[model samples]
Target: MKKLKKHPDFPKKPLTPYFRFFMEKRAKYAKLHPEMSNLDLTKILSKKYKELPEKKKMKYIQDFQREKQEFERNLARFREDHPDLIQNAKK
Candidate 1:
């Protein structure tokens, strides 16, 4: 398939909790270790995440599940706005 561009305001799929966890820490870790490359930072993030307690990770998971519902509703609105693209996206 060709590389197609999406609209700037597209309603994207929500991040998984694990991804959110990485993103949250990526900000702080990048500042703490400014010279670290993206690959190394993500590796550090995964390592740290494995050491994280279940309770801590649960918070991210819960938040994501709730917003995931919100995303469906948001997408419904997006669907109405971009009828053609949404339809094309289906099949």
Candidate 2:
């Protein structure tokens, strides 16, 4: 099979707060449980995230919203600066 082409703008979007939290926790989890597989660690983290109280979860959600707004502003600016590139990517 032919290799699929990767997007030049891969990861243009910023990580949401929850994802940021997951990465931080994943790092600590990896250090503590060296033998654990990524999938297993993700499952454990998912459970932990779900177990978090609403108030605590709201903080991450709020942060995510703020970051999303910033991402949108940056994306708009990028599009404005490179309309030709944006159109080419769409094709």
Candidate 3:
């Protein structure tokens, strides 16, 4: 089977593009419309954050699943390797 490979230009840091885009846009808007209220700017930021790449969002879910699986496997192995530690338990 061919080895799995990530894209050469895959995002190094998740949500990096989203953050930079928002920062640049916010600065530009603030500069052009100095009268915009703080609350309005905050609302805009909140909406922008919600629009992050779906892949970035799912990356966190996939990472959590991978971590949980690995942890459970190691925990089971540890218990098996140290059966004497268990109370009134048998094979």
Candidate 4:
């Protein structure tokens, strides 16, 4: 068998804090309601997210902003380190 190599220029974006929170809630809800489909659970979670207070929502928003900044910095560094690979990925 031939050895497989990982791509160097794959963009690995970090998950937002809101998505992290949602994933946790999704698991818990799935356990409680095994009969529910993923889409149904997602709808419920979306409604719950909308119902969250401004202060609570701000916490997730702030966390997401911080992670986004870090992601941007890391992406820049990766592009600089592997310019050729990045160019190949675009083509």
Candidate 5:
């Protein structure tokens, strides 16, 4: 049989540098604290990010090129932080 082509989004590129860091932090916390709910975890991160200074927030969306870069960085960091969980997919 002929091999199928890969899907455009199948490779799973990083979404953003900050987001990637956020994901890693989340996974580490979740693994360390299994009793916490996802909602609670999200809230914690959201609050943390929300507390960022205005200057940092502007850096996230400074321009289209930077925005794209941020996405990829975040994705990579996230994958690195949760290799086993991401690769095996817990649920």
Candidate 6:
């Protein structure tokens, strides 16, 4: 990963709300079972996630939507600030 090749206007893209849930849960679950492998832990959470409430899941969507809007606004300004950066292959 050529991660963050820096000019610093780069935005955060927090992905997959289920992922957000995974992060939130991983620490708690691992604390209870410290030996669990990270990859396997995700499967355990995957099964558990389906049993979770849709109401709670909707909040993640709200969080994502909020974050996406902020990114667009920041991206909007960043592109204005640096038009030479961010070349898209598809016009």
TM-score of candidate 2 on Cα atoms, chains taken together: 0.61
Which parts of model 5 have CA positions greater than 4 angstroms off? 1-14, 57-91
Per-residue accuracy of model 2 over 1-68 as CA lDDT, tens digit each: 22222223332455665687899778887887778768878888788888888778788878777776
Sort by TM-score, best first: 4, 2, 6, 1, 5, 3
lDDT of 1 by residue, 1-91 (tens): 3222332234446787778878867787778777766887888878887888877978888887778678766564654443343323333
Question: lDDT of each structure?
Answer: 0.67, 0.65, 0.50, 0.65, 0.54, 0.67
**Cα lDDT of model 6 by residue, 8-33, tens digit:** 35444556678788888889777777
Candidate 3 or 1, higher TM-score: 1
Candidate 2 positional error at 64, Å: 1.3
Clashing pairs in 5: 14-71, 14-75, 15-71, 15-75, 16-70, 16-71, 16-74, 17-70, 17-74, 20-74
Candidates 4 and 5 compared by lDDT, better number? 4
Global lDDT for candidate 5? 0.54
Per-residue lDDT value at 70 in model 1: 80
Candidate 3 or 4, higher lDDT? Answer: 4
What TM-scores do the predictions have?
A: 0.56, 0.61, 0.31, 0.61, 0.42, 0.57
Error of 1 at 27 (Å): 2.2
**Candidate 5 structure quality by residue, lDDT tens digits, 1-91:** 2222211223333255457547758776687667866877777778777788756756653643465566655544443332232233323
What is the Cα-based lDDT of residue 2 in candidate 5?
Answer: 25
Error of 6 at 22 (Å): 1.1
Q: Candidate 2: minimum summed lDDT over ten consecutive residues — where?
A: 1-10
lDDT of 4: 0.65
